[PDB]
């Protein structure tokens, strides 16, 4: 409880920080790319989804068979991740 005290006091701005980053599509993994505007992505539920690349992620930073964070609403990719 004492280590969680200062953190609980620091949990105040988390409400205002809750609006972004909150979206999770559960990290669907891609396969290949036929063309740059449209990419084919296969979720772990074995359902293939297609979405255009956002402006926040460079096309040169995309690797074949790489797991990245993807929005479950706008369906686009806000930020990638190292692992």
């Amino acid at each position: 409880a004492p280590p969680a005290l200062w953190d609980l006091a620091a949990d105040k701005q988390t409400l205002q920080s809750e609006q972004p980053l909150q979206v999770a599509r559960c990290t669907k993994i891609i396969n290949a790319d036929s063309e740059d505007p449209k990419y084919i992505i296969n979720v772990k539920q074995f359902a293939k989804f297609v979405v255009d690349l956002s402006d926040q992620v460079a096309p040169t930073d995309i690797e074949e068979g790489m797991r990245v964070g993807v929005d479950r609403n706008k369906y686009q990719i806000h930020i990638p991740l190292p692992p």
Binding site: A32, S34, I40, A47, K48, F49, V50, D52
Partner: protein, 351 residues
Amino acid sequence: KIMKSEVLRVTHELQAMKDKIKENSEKIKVNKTLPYLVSNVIELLDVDPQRKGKCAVIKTSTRQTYFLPVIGLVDAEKLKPGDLVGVNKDSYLILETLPTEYDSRVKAMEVDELDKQIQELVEAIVLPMNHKEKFENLGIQPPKGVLMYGPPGTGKTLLARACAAQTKATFLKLAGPQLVQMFIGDGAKLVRDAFALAKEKAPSIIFIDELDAIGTKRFDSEKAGDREVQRTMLELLNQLDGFQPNTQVKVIAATNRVDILDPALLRSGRLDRKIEFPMPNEEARARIMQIHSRKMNVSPDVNYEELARCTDDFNGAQCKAVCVEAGMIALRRGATELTHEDYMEGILEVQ
């Protein structure tokens, strides 16, 4: 010209149409831009009794079957049981159909960016990409299937691979055992998919090897493991006969041994060209070896007699291996330039 004065009104109506289609053609871009998932499409002809019967069978990736007819814009390559189709929310309609093939994996096999006989060969592979414009007047129909065979030790594989570089087109690699798998009924799918990629892509180069081993009809009646590539070849010939699209990109076949041959392989669409190799000469091999080694730095004094004489029943890849071997010890010799004796030394080394 008083009767032709009514044409102006018509043109005004037409340009008015062109002006009023701007919006409905504008909404297309924003509506069809992002299909949310991918579903499998299967064509099934229904009957309504215009009121013409039209329908289709859909399969979602979530394994939920729905109902829907055939709609969308003008279709050409569509209506085929393919995949990767555009779909909107709850609409389950069809907008953009793109074929990526099925189970992709077989397709990404590989990505590639003797004078008298090789002359005929070069002319043979060049002419379908060249003389097509002259084939109208002359009425000359280019051969499709070409059979390249001969005694072992020729090196025809890397020779044809070298000609593939001369074709400047894309080259593919398919072997005999690659057609043999644990599953069943793979032949039809493989052939149809390969022909699909050959239909969609550029006029690339397709070369298969070892058609003799997989084409064995096994005179002995006891047992054997593979009957599949037999009927696969039969179906291949069937599609190379009864199909008009066969005028499209050619498929090159090669056999190592002449012990097994199918009399039904004779046709324009099927195997046509037959060239036997009567113990290929030396000086020619020395010539192509010179062409291959012209890039590397070598002291420009060569008798060629020793290297031509010391080569007996050796492949082209083995000659390139002789060059490589000659380059191997030249590094530890301390010399920055390849010598003459290093060639024969390499010959006596690896062979």
